Design an enzyme around this catalytic site. Structure first.
Site, PDB file in Angstrom:
ATOM      1  N   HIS A 182      -8.673  10.738  -0.235  1.00 51.56           N
ATOM      2  CA  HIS A 182      -7.897   9.517  -0.280  1.00 51.56           C
ATOM      3  C   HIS A 182      -6.632   9.656   0.562  1.00 51.56           C
ATOM      4  CE1 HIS A 182      -5.313   6.396  -2.271  1.00 51.56           C
ATOM      5  NE2 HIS A 182      -6.444   5.713  -2.232  1.00 51.56           N
ATOM      6  N   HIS A 230       0.798  -1.217   0.000  1.00 46.70           N
ATOM      7  CA  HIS A 230       0.000   0.000   0.000  1.00 46.70           C
ATOM      8  C   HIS A 230       0.836   1.274   0.000  1.00 46.70           C
ATOM      9  CE1 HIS A 230      -3.592   2.400   1.550  1.00 46.70           C
ATOM     10  NE2 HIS A 230      -4.020   1.803   0.454  1.00 46.70           N
ATOM     11  N   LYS A 280       2.980   4.445  -0.790  1.00 42.28           N
ATOM     12  CA  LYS A 280       3.081   5.354  -1.932  1.00 42.28           C
ATOM     13  C   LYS A 280       4.272   6.277  -1.712  1.00 42.28           C
ATOM     14  CE  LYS A 280      -1.710   4.667  -2.536  1.00 42.28           C
ATOM     15  NZ  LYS A 280      -1.821   3.343  -1.902  1.00 42.28           N
TER      16      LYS A 280
HETATM   17  C1  LIG Z   1      -8.178  -2.207   1.693  1.00 36.78           C
HETATM   18  N1  LIG Z   1      -8.351  -1.943   0.275  1.00 36.78           N
HETATM   19  C2  LIG Z   1      -7.570  -0.899  -0.372  1.00 36.78           C
HETATM   20  C3  LIG Z   1      -6.687  -1.202  -1.400  1.00 36.78           C
HETATM   21  C4  LIG Z   1      -5.949  -0.190  -2.002  1.00 36.78           C
HETATM   22  C5  LIG Z   1      -6.099   1.127  -1.584  1.00 36.78           C
HETATM   23  C6  LIG Z   1      -5.268   2.224  -2.260  1.00 36.78           C
HETATM   24  O1  LIG Z   1      -5.785   3.296  -2.654  1.00 36.78           O
HETATM   25  O2  LIG Z   1      -4.046   2.023  -2.444  1.00 36.78           O
HETATM   26  C7  LIG Z   1      -6.985   1.423  -0.555  1.00 36.78           C
HETATM   27  C8  LIG Z   1      -7.163   2.856  -0.056  1.00 36.78           C
HETATM   28  O3  LIG Z   1      -6.145   3.538   0.192  1.00 36.78           O
HETATM   29  O4  LIG Z   1      -8.307   3.354   0.117  1.00 36.78           O
HETATM   30  C9  LIG Z   1      -7.710   0.411   0.049  1.00 36.78           C
END
Ligand SMILES: CNc1ccc(C(=O)O)c(C(=O)O)c1
Length: 438
Positions: free
Chosen positions: A327, A102, A104
């Site tokens: 976000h 996750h 970034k």
């Molecule tokens: C738990 N499921 C998610 C998968 C990817 C993302 C992302 O944007 O990388 C997010 C989020 O940040 O809302 C949730």
């Protein structure tokens, strides 16, 4: 400003609300440095779009994409990148079930030095278009002269901590970036790194990651004040995990307990959670499709209706972004009247055990499923006891911290409901004239 905390540009707001915001094209501009190589850590990628965000003169420089995709998803990403001979890929290991890469982050190597960007957006057009997203921009880190022996370390230990985060991948492409970081001087860094990496951590390693990392930093580098029980905790996020059958299972027993730590000595603390309501999404710039990036399932939500009494609406008049769905993820510790804050964290971590960690084995082991990364702003790292809250995010001392949404947060009304992305909404249309039928 010493903080170097930015929001992304939002298409459609008045220019005063984008003066001081950054688009990805600004970050990659030659004005920020003469690019030699870059690494893009992320979850989701549109490779065609991403390459077009680099300046044309830099589009053939090496790019490393660090991702967590497996099986057909991994095959799809490789197919996206195959047209570009300069793009390499690193698959981050996810050895614990239901984990996610996750984090970034951009690592930007220049002729002039090195820059680190830790942020909240996926590398797709929609994440930089009409959302509220957060960016931390490091200083330009100069190279250490060959033959010179110095640490290049900051008072916040950011250099060693970033190397430690990358070492956890055990990846050859990232050892190359570790060696790059070793050769640069990161001593001007005034933020603390807070990362999560997958694993089961005991003993000395328990404080390295997740909410125990946050707890350790707050114990060591923050001070408790009188009436600390009155200083709320605020968490603000775009996704919610399964937290258990009641608040004592995780939310208020270990998560909140770490968040309320201040200082070294041994709860009534208010907990505000900010998450978009259905109405927030319906009336947003994107309309209901904004809810595609707010992934809260009905199967999860109906097992924890207790949680929604903690929920507060998204509101961001201070930055002109009330209709730009969040976000960004942020956590902070305001004073009882919300005029000051004891600390501020911007991170990729949502409100989930996978991201923050959950205790196992009679409280001796912290288990984390995912990769996450954020930066913590502590007043002590700036020579201060607290941060004053900036009244208007883009307004004009520079020692006030730019909180991007409104305080105090507003509780859901009785007719409000949390955005749940996989049920229909057909009672009222969105800003584009449409309903939501999953
Ligand atoms: C738990 N499921 C998610 C998968 C990817 C993302 C992302 O944007 O990388 C997010 C989020 O940040 O809302 C949730």
């Amino acid at each position: 400003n010493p903080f170097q905390f930015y929001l992304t540009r939002v298409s459609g707001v008045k220019p005063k609300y984008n003066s001081g915001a950054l688009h990805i094209k600004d970050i990659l501009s030659p004005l920020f440095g003469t690019l030699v190589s870059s690494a893009q850590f992320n979850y989701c990628f549109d490779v065609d779009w991403l390459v077009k965000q680099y300046p044309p003169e830099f589009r053939k420089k090496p790019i490393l994409l660090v991702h967590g995709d497996k099986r057909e998803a991994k095959a799809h990403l490789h197919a996206q990148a195959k047209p570009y001979e300069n793009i390499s890929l690193c698959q981050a290991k996810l050895d614990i079930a239901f984990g996610t890469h996750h984090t970034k982050m951009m690592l930007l190597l220049y002729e002039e030095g090195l820059r680190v960007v830790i942020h909240t957006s996926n590398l797709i057009h929609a994440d930089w278009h009409q959302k509220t997203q957060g960016i931390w921009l490091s200083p330009l880190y100069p190279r250490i002269a060959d033959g010179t022996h110095k640490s290049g370390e900051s008072p916040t230990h950011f250099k060693a901590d970033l190397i430690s985060y990358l070492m956890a991948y055990n990846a050859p492409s990232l050892k190359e970036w570790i060696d790059v970081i070793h050769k640069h001087d990161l001593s001007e860094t005034n933020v603390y790194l807070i990362g999560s990496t997958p694993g089961r951590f005991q003993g000395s390693q328990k404080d390295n990651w997740g909410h125990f990392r946050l707890k350790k930093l707050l114990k060591d580098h923050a001070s408790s004040m009188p009436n600390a029980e009155s200083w709320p905790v605020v968490g603000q996020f775009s996704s919610v995990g399964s937290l258990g059958a009641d608040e004592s299972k995780w939310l208020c027993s270990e998560f909140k307990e770490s968040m309320l730590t201040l200082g070294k000595e041994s709860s009534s603390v208010p907990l505000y959670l900010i998450y978009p309501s259905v109405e927030n999404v319906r009336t947003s710039l994107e309309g209901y499709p904004a809810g595609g990036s707010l992934p809260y399932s009905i199967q999860t939500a109906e097992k924890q209706n207790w949680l929604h009494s903690y929920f507060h609406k998204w509101s961001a008049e201070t930055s002109g972004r009330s209709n730009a769905m969040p976000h960004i993820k942020t956590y902070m510790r305001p004073s009882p009247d919300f005029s000051k804050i004891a600390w501020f964290l911007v991170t990729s971590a949502n409100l989930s055990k996978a991201a923050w960690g959950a205790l196992e084995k009679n409280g001796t082991q912290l288990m984390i499923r995912s990769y996450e990364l954020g930066v913590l702003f502590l007043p002590s790292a700036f020579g201060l006891d607290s941060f004053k809250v900036k009244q208007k995010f883009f307004a004009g001392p520079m020692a006030t911290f730019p909180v991007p949404y409104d305080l105090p947060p507003e509780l859901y009304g009785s007719k409000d409901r949390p955005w749940i992305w996989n049920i229909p909404y057909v009672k009222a249309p969105d800003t584009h004239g449409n309903m939501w039928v999953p």
